[PDB]
Amino acid sequence: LCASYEPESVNKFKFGAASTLKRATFGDNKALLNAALHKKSEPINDNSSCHFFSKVPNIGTGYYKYFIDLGLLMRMER
Amino acid sequence: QHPREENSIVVELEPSLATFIKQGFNNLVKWPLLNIGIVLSNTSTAVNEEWLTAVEHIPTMKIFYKHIHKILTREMGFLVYLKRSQSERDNYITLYDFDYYIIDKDTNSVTMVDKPTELKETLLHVFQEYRLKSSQTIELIAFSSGTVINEDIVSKLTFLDVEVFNREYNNVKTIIDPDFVFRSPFIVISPMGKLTFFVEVYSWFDFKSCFKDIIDFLEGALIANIHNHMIKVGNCDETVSSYNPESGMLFVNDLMTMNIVNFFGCNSRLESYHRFDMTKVDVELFIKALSDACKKILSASNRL
Amino acid sequence: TQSIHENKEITEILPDNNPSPPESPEDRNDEPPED
Amino acid sequence: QALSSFHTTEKSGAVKQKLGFNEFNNLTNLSKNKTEIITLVSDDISKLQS
Amino acid sequence: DIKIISNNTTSINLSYITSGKNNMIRSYIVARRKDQTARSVIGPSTSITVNEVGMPAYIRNTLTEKIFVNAFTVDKVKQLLASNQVKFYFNKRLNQLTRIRQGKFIKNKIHLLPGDWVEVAVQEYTSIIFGRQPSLHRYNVIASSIRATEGDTIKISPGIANSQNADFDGDEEWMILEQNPKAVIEQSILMYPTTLLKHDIHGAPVYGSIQDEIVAAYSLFRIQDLCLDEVLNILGKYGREFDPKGKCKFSGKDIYTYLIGEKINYPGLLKDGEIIANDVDSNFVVAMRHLSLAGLLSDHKSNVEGINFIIKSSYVFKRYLSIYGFGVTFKDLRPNSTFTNKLEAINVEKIELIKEAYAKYLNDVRDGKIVPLSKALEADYVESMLSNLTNLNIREIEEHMRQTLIDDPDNNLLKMAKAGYKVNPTELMYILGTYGQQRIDGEPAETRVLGRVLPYYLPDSKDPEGRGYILNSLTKGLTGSQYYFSMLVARSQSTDIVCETSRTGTLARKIIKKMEDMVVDGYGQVVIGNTLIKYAANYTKILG
Amino acid sequence: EMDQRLGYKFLVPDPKAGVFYRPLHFQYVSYSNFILHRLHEILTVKRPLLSFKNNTERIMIEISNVKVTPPDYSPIIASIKGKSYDALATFTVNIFKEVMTKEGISITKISSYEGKDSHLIKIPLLIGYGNKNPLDTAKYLVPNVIGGVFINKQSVEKVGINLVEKITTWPKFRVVKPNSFTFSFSSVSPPNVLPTRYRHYKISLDISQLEALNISSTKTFITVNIVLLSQYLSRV
Amino acid sequence: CIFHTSRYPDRDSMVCHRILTYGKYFETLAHDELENYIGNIRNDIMNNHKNRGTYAVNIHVLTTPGLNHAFSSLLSGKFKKSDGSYRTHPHYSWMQNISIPRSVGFYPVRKYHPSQYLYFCSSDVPERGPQVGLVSQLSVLSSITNILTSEYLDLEKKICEYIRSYYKDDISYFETGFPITIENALVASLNPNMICDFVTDFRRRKRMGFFGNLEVGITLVRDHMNEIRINIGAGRLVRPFLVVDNGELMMDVCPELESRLDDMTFSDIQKEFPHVIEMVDIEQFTFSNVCESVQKFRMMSKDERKQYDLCDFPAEFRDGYVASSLVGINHNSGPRAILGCAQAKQAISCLSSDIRNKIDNGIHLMYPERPIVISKALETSKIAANCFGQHVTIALMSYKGINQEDGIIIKKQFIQRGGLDIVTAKKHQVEIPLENFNNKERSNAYSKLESNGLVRLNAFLESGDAMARNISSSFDVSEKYTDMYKSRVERVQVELTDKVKVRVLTMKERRPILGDKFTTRTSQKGTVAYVADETELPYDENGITPDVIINSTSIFSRKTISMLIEVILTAAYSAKPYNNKGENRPVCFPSSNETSIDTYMQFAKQCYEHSNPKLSDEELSDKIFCEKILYDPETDKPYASKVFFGPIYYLRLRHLTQDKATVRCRGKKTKLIRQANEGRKRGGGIKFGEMERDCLIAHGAA
Amino acid sequence: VFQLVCSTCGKDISHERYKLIIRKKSLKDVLVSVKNECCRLKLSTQIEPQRNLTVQPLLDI
Ligand SMILES: [Mg+2]
Ligand SMILES: [Zn+2]
């Protein structure tokens, strides 16, 4: 609550840079219209934003990014 | 005196032998119930289910008391048939209103059995007020638990209308349960080696002969089962009783093993390890004890 | 009962009774103004 | 704690801060323009008596 | 948006999607209904461990599980097709689902290329997610191994009942089955009960014994003269490795030492793997307690040892119950009418003494002899007298408990009291002593019409019994007005419960939404978004 | 123990007073009072509708010949067949102009209607004790039946509870604000005055303004000082 | 009231309210519709005169009074701003026919006001939902007044004549007197010095029938409001009370009453012995001085006695008819009483005499038994003669640690023989266009259909069968049976019109299985957790094994003492169930007991001593306290201590497992969003809520 | 008045039931020959429910 320079209630996203979809899922009912009016461009990191677009949340196993190393496979010959 | 009298027979034996006989009786003596029931006509004030459940538990052993052995070995079956309507006088149903048939189960013969007159003083159902205009009738048939309903037996039911039976049986067959259903003829316990039978004595037939037949059947079955008892002598798989000579440890996990080893000085329960020496077990001594106990049981029953 | 480490005890808060699960739903001027 | 009536109300003659869900909700809301319970502690009692 | 001009909130327009609590996002995007699900009543089973859950037949014959076609499983899939055990087939290269019938389909339609899959009846030891509602914390939803069972109820081990706040008076639970391979691995590791043994914050175990088991534990530690056969009868299938070193008589301490297969010391409880406390009580074998032996075993080695101890100890406790039994009777509570009559006479005398004191003060004030007290002070004095009487009853009950323990050491009710289960001097005071002052909002009931509460008392009555002080006990039986006061308290409690049930959910959801995105970064720091909240996670950078 | 016997005596049936089943008795009467007596009084009206000239030219509407009859089948037949259990009520209506003349009364018919053969009103009927309705005075009681239900159009059985009236019998007090109070009450005509008339009054008092101790209503009475109103009414 | 607010009747008080019965709904609706009818006629005539001439009355406006729609809407459940007046009857119990008509609802107040006591049941209230604290139940001794218009007028005239005749000189004070009102109509002002006499002389005359009505209410308000109020209207609560006249209990100065009470009815007592009982309404009660009991009255001095106006009846008369099913509710905690009242209505009983005739939903008990430890109210209301349970043998012990957290062990042979067996009956209804019914094509769903397109009698329907042929034209579009168990077709009724209407009644017997719910009369509810064989249960020296085993700890942790007493009394009844005349004799153990435990123990001791004259002291004590030594069936050895073991009246509730089971694999979808549909009867799925989503995120399983 | 055995112990109680319901002997005389508690309670508290005649036919069009 005291993360900013002033205390902030739990009913409002005043100082925190919450995402538009985060506000909408919290229950704002008008965040999308204001974002359209102000022309806001946002990334996709929140759990709400990830759930909206069917992405893996950055929680637990999903906190990391995975690749596949094809070097060994391409060094094998039939 | 009364048509029915409650009695007890008490004998004193070794605790383990008494427990063995009690559990053997409760496992091997099965009297079949009349659970294959078909209601052909019902314009009474009671639904089919009430009639069927009431008739399933008719105490039939007092009617078929002359065929105890074969019914116990399941070489013979029985059925009851009822057809009764309202009337001006005696507007109720007793146990004398049924008909009782014995089924040979080899040639599928169906033969009628005699009825005691005392059955005229039993009660099952009381009709409502007699109205000549309306109809109030019940008709049903019931077979014991082991019977198989095929055209061979059905062709013998000359007292029925076959078409009605076929229709109604095809209606009910899907809810009749498939497995065997039975009852214990009387109550048997053995608190601390004190073997007690709680039984019922009726006026019209001799109870001692029936008791003797049941006891003989039980003794034969128990002796055979003892003779066919084997204890694995490999490793313990935690599924059957077994013996490990390497450690000299017996795992008890069945009732007969428990009873015998306790008869020879152990103090085991039904899922437990014990340090027991299998050389102390002498089957012939156990069988002799069982035979003596059966003779004593018959002597006790004779003095009623 | 006995006390060993009472300064670290943890208290239990669990209701004994809970509500059963829900089942399927399945002019005469004759009243006061009520201002 | 709320659903098992863990807390029991009490009567007091002086200002106290309450226990239970309602007080926690009040704290979280952080509503302005209300009275606050100021406490004064000392060892010279005259300053408090005044 | 009709609401711009009007004030009706029933017409359907574009804004209806974000009307209120029934948004589209919070009812279809972060929540939904699923296909592989079930719900049913629950019951207890003694053949299921905390890691397993029993599934009824009617669910096993409907739910289906996925087998992927690859080099390892192709032949098995072909055999399943041959045996008429495949229920569905999915062609991944066409995104086409076919309902493989039983003699009502084609065999050529199947070609089993890699990446396809088939669906068959669900098999035992498959992990399934299940839980109870409301899901207040992490332990209401867990993934366990399937075991076949009888009946039409979902069977659970009583070991997890507290962690879910469940009982068997009509509760229900729900099941879901996700078969994506990543989800399968994560269910097998992260959501396994053996991994959730120790609570996240205070660290105590979340699984343990309940109810009569506790008493059994308390009794087992006290039994003294046992031969080897009786020890093995108690132990059961865990008695293979018991070592009768050189003894011929055993105690319950020997059994507990055998169960704790470790040589560890902990100030108070243990020394060289042996219990040095006086008795075994609820704090030892119940979940969420600070003296649990499973907790010490887990601290010593790992959670596997803790779960093993829980399972084994529960088994032996129930075998003790099977061998010796346990029951409370009426003759344990009230053998005769001596103590109750004594306490009743004491109450009858003391209440009248209090009334006479109050009347003397009132009469003195009514004449010009003393200045009256304030209302608050007078209430305080009366309350003090009544509280003294209540404490007198408490002391009487405690002394009676002590004396009965001396005379009749085998009292089952006092066994429950000692073990630490639901019995204490206050409850016995209610049953046998006095019911005491009834309060609403911390004060007695208020006067309403003629300065009174009920017309059984005169106007402006000062009688304490007439404002909610109950004298009788449950064994004696309350009277009509005492019953009124009792029911007043009860019904007020229930109504408050309903209102709080409404409000707490809203506050909880708000808090959960606010803190949801705070995690530990890769350096053991607590951060949210791009801000640093705390340098060291738990002050230690160790698991909580 | 005599008080216990006297209490028991109130729970048993009392044939002399027409109580055959105490637990629901007060309900049966509550319906027997309406279907037999109050309906006739409510329906049988003779009222002016319009007036002209000066109280010498007015139209009059009269209702009379009210009859109520029960069905012809038992409630079990209604349940099986799927019918409904309703009683049929019919009445005759006259609309006629009247002109006051020195010779007496002048009557000129304008219209008349009857419902002798029609479902003019269908009133749900209460089954009652023994499957017996107040209209039918049969002599057979079905045992173990206590009734208390209705059968609606779709052959569904209905049952209801009692409700508390909105009009109280004591004035309501309310603290509008600090040192400002109100006191509201109601007046209703006796039972034998058809149609019934209602009035709702409020007295307002405020410490700051003691000259405005005022009694008022909504568009039915003046706002006057209550003390002066009492002076006017009682002449004291 | 401005200066002493707490002493003036509050707005939620029952002192200032009245209640509507069945008749008043219809009366008000008739009033409103008649007024609307006349208004419409007037408007039509005015319009016709405005446009045309001759004052013509349009037809089709004086043929539709509009009462039919009003009554239909009333029975549907709409009445002004209330929506609970009427409802469809749920056929759970036979006692509901009493319980629902005697309820009183209040507009949306949830606290227990002191004025509801003694006139409403204290314990019978909803425990959860939106109705919490808004529905109350009358006591067995309460009622609601009725009065006709002619009787109203006659009574009012008599009262006015009495006032004006007997007090000619002292009814014109108007400045320092007590105003006398009849239905809030001021008719006189009495001299203060004569108030008491006026009331006393009045009440006496009321009890003799001098005014022709024995329910007139007279209240004397004296704090400083100084009023005399007389009420005669309808919709008032009234109870009988014992009269105290000049410091004297009339019941004690009427010797002939004790000898004559046997052959007299209540009204005979009122007529022949006035001044013993008075009918008092709630407002008059709230301002009187009432002694709580006869025993407490007899212990007071004459000077103390002189202050009281009435004396109350025993406490068992302050409960409803539902609460009268329970036993000794005043020996337990209150919450248990609330729950017991809630569940006593859900017990299964002999629901209807027309089990085979009525086509309705219901549940029926198959082999009923009449309880024999009861109160008088349960006997007079006939709730006892229609049965709601059976007598079963119970043992209070732990069984292998299985029966925990309210689970119970039940015996297999008890279930086989018919123990607590019920039958559930259900109603099915369909409407079919005539062409589809007569359409001539055998689909696999029409296996149970006869040649006439209707299901066959006595056949069993499955989860995919149809009851009547309905083909849309070469497709089957008929509805389907959708229960996971089968049912037998008991009755079929058909109506032929433009459409075809088919109704079917089906029945199914349901022996107990795992998950089924039972309870006792002290709110000890539990589900079946294990079905034990007769040979796996402990037994006593007579070879009796319990039908039900319940864990004993809950009895003492919840403080349901009365349960124990019940068992003892039941056991005593079994030893000697008849009077000294040989007639069946029930045992009276009322809710709100008031009798001592020692007296019950003495009664039980006498019963056993009559049964077996030769018993040792230890045996007699064991029988009285219901204690026995039980043996382990496996080893035939005793347990450590004696067990509580005996018979009790046991109830079966209506919550069955197979009615709650649900499972989904694949099915339909909602069109707009394309997700699983909803509805257990429609094969819908279970909803994965966002609290479960939070839990899964707490595991770290992304 | 319908079941032919005791539901608790399984004993036969049909003769006593006839002796009670049809011959209308005293409950004492009837119970003279019944010992078990369950059986006495069953013979003392069991009834046949009150029911009307059945409307026929069961299938009506
Ligand atoms: Mg529960
Ligand atoms: Zn019995």
DSSP G132-198: TTSEEEB-TT-EE----HHHHHHHHHHHHHHHHHHTGGGSB--SSSEEEEESS-EEEEE-GGGHHHH
Instruction: Report the distance separating Cα G585 and Cα E97, nearest Å.
Output: 72
Q: How far is A71 from chain E (nearest CA, A)?
A: 23
**What angle do the packed helices B207-227 and B15-28 form, to 10 degrees?**
100
What is the per-residue DSSP string for chain F?
-HHHHHHHHHHS-BGGGTBS-GGGHHHHHHHHHIIIIIHHHHH--EEEEEEETTTTEEEEEEEEEEEEE--SS-HHHHHHHT---EEEEEEEEEEEEEEEETTEEEEEEEEEE--TTS-SEEEE---TTTT--SS---S---TT-----EE-TTS-EEEE-EEE-S--SSPEEEEEETTEEEEEEEEE--TTSSS--EEEEEEEEETTEEEEEEEE-SSSS--EEHHHHHHHHH--
Q: How far is G222 from chain E (nearest CA, A)?
A: 9
The angstrom resolution of this structure is 2.5
CB G354 within 8 A of CB G372: no
Tell me if E233 and B275 make a contact (CB, 8 A cut-off): no
Residue B127, sorted as left (phi over 0), alpha (psi -120 to 50) or beta, turns out to be: beta
Instruction: Report the distance separating Cα E538 and Cα G108, nearest Å.
Output: 50
Question: Would you give the DSSP letter of residue G48?
Answer: H
Q: Is the peptide bond before F195 cis (omega within 30 degrees of 0)?
A: yes
Tokens 């957290």 found at: G405
The structure tokens listed for E98 are: 């076919």
At F122, give phi and psi (nearest 5°). -115, 115
Instruction: Report the distance separating Cα E321 and Cα G397, nearest Å.
Output: 10
Tell me, yes or no, if E101 comes closer than 8 A to chain G by beta carbon: no
CB E321 within 8 A of CB E216: yes
- Ligand 2 (ion): residues with CB under 5 Å are H 6, 8-9, 11, 36, 38-39
At E528, give phi and psi (nearest 5°). -130, 130
Candidates C29, C31, C34, partner chain F, best to mutate (most F CBs within 10 A): C29
At B47, give phi and psi (nearest 5°). -70, 170
Tell me, yes or no, if A1 comes closer than 8 A to chain G by beta carbon: no
The answer, yes or no, to whether A and D have at least 3 beta-carbon pairs within 8 Å is yes
Q: Identify the helix (H) or strand (E) that includes residue E121.
A: strand E117-121
Q: How far is H50 from chain G (nearest CA, A)?
A: 6
CB G123 within 8 A of CB G323: yes
In 3D space, the residue among B174, B143, B149, B154 whose CA is nearest the CA of residue B56 turns out to be B143
Tell me if E165 and C21 make a contact (CB, 8 A cut-off): no
Tell me if E162 and C5 make a contact (CB, 8 A cut-off): no
- Report the separation in Å between the CA atom of B219 and the middle of ligand 2, taken as the mean of its atom positions: 29
At E90, give phi and psi (nearest 5°). -120, 120
| Residues of chain C contacting F198 with CB distance shorter than 8 Å | 28-30
Can you name the residues that pair with E155 across neighbouring β-strands?
A: E43, E54
Overall residue count recorded for chain F in this entry: 236
DSSP H helices in G372-472: 376-380, 412-417, 434-438
CB G318 within 8 A of CB G139: yes
Tokens 């257990």 found at: G680
Q: Identify the helix (H) or strand (E) that includes residue B48.
A: helix B48-56
Instruction: Report the distance separating Cα G384 and Cα G94, nearest Å.
Output: 10
CB E533 within 8 A of CB E527: yes
Q: Is G165 exposed, middle or buried (0-12, 13-18, 19+ CB in 10 A)?
A: exposed
Instruction: Report the distance separating Cα B221 and Cα D7, nearest Å.
Output: 68
The structure tokens listed for G504 are: 């079917």
Virtual torsion, Cα E22, E24, E29, E35, nearest 10 deg: 80
CB G468 within 8 A of CB G476: no
Instruction: Report the distance separating Cα D35 and Cα E454, nearest Å.
Output: 39
Cβ neighbours of residue G523 under 8 Å, at least 6 residues apart? Answer: G332, G336, G337, G339, G340, G343, G560
Reduced to 3 DSSP states, what percent helix, strand and coil does chain G have, rounded to the nearest 5?
A: 30, 25, 45
CB G110 within 8 A of CB E486: no
Tell me, yes or no, if C13 comes closer than 8 A to chain D by beta carbon: yes
Residue H36, sorted as left (phi over 0), alpha (psi -120 to 50) or beta, turns out to be: beta
Instruction: Report the distance separating Cα E478 and Cα G331, nearest Å.
Output: 7
Instruction: Report the distance separating Cα G118 and Cα E454, nearest Å.
Output: 10
Instruction: Report the distance separating Cα G607 and Cα G602, nearest Å.
Output: 9
CB G411 within 8 A of CB G418: no
At B220, give phi and psi (nearest 5°). -60, -45
What distances in angstroms separate CA G4 from CA E400, E427, E459, G9, G225, one per listed residue?
50, 41, 15, 11, 11
Tokens 């006095």 found at: E434
**What angle do the packed helices E303-324 and E293-300 form, to 10 degrees?**
150
The answer, yes or no, to whether A and F have at least 3 beta-carbon pairs within 8 Å is no
Tell me, yes or no, if E230 comes closer than 8 A to chain B by beta carbon: yes
- Report the separation in Å between the CA atom of G525 and the middle of ligand 1, taken as the mean of its atom positions: 10
Tell me if B267 and E233 make a contact (CB, 8 A cut-off): yes
In 3D space, the residue among E210, E240, E233, E236 whose CA is nearest the CA of residue E310 turns out to be E210
CB E238 within 8 A of CB E316: yes
Tokens 């959910």 found at: E505
Instruction: Report the distance separating Cα E513 and Cα E141, nearest Å.
Output: 19
Tell me if H54 and G357 make a contact (CB, 8 A cut-off): yes
Q: Identify the helix (H) or strand (E) that includes residue H15.
A: helix H14-21
Q: Identify the helix (H) or strand (E) that includes residue B202.
A: strand B194-202
In 3D space, the residue among F76, G504, B167 whose CA is nearest the CA of residue H60 turns out to be G504
DSSP H helices in D1-50: 21-29, 45-49
Virtual torsion, Cα E167, E168, E170, E174, nearest 10 deg: 70
CB E55 within 8 A of CB E144: no
Contact map slice: G 641-700 vs A, CB within 8 A: 697, 699-700
Q: Identify the helix (H) or strand (E) that includes residue B283.
A: helix B283-302
Per residue, what are the HEC states of E229-240? HHHHHHHHHHCC
The structure tokens listed for D37 are: 């319970």
Q: Is the peptide bond before H57 cis (omega within 30 degrees of 0)?
A: yes
Residue G237, sorted as left (phi over 0), alpha (psi -120 to 50) or beta, turns out to be: beta
Q: What is the CA radius of gyration of chain D?
A: 15
Question: Would you give the DSSP letter of residue C6?
Answer: G
Instruction: Report the distance separating Cα G634 and Cα D23, nearest Å.
Output: 59
Residue G61 DSSP SS3: coil
Instruction: Report the distance separating Cα G238 and Cα G279, nearest Å.
Output: 6
In 3D space, the residue among H50, H48, H59 whose CA is nearest the CA of residue H3 turns out to be H48
In 3D space, the residue among G139, G283, G606, G214 whose CA is nearest the CA of residue G615 turns out to be G606
Tell me, yes or no, if F234 comes closer than 8 A to chain C by beta carbon: no
What distances in angstroms separate CA B164 from CA B42, B147, C24, E327, G380, one per listed residue?
13, 20, 42, 56, 47
| Residues of chain B contacting E239 with CB distance shorter than 8 Å | 272-273
Tell me if G356 and B45 make a contact (CB, 8 A cut-off): yes
Tokens 């006839």 found at: H18
| C-alpha torsion sign, points G26, G32, G38, G40 | negative
Can you name the residues that pair with B242 across neighbouring β-strands?
A: B232, B251
Say which amino acid occupies B294.
C
Max Cα-Cα span within chain E = 113
Pairing of strands G227-231, G178-182: parallel
The structure tokens listed for B158 are: 């000359």
What distances in angstroms separate CA G144 from CA E203, F159, G215, G269, G270, one per listed residue?
62, 18, 10, 21, 19
Virtual torsion, Cα H7, H12, H13, H15, nearest 10 deg: 160
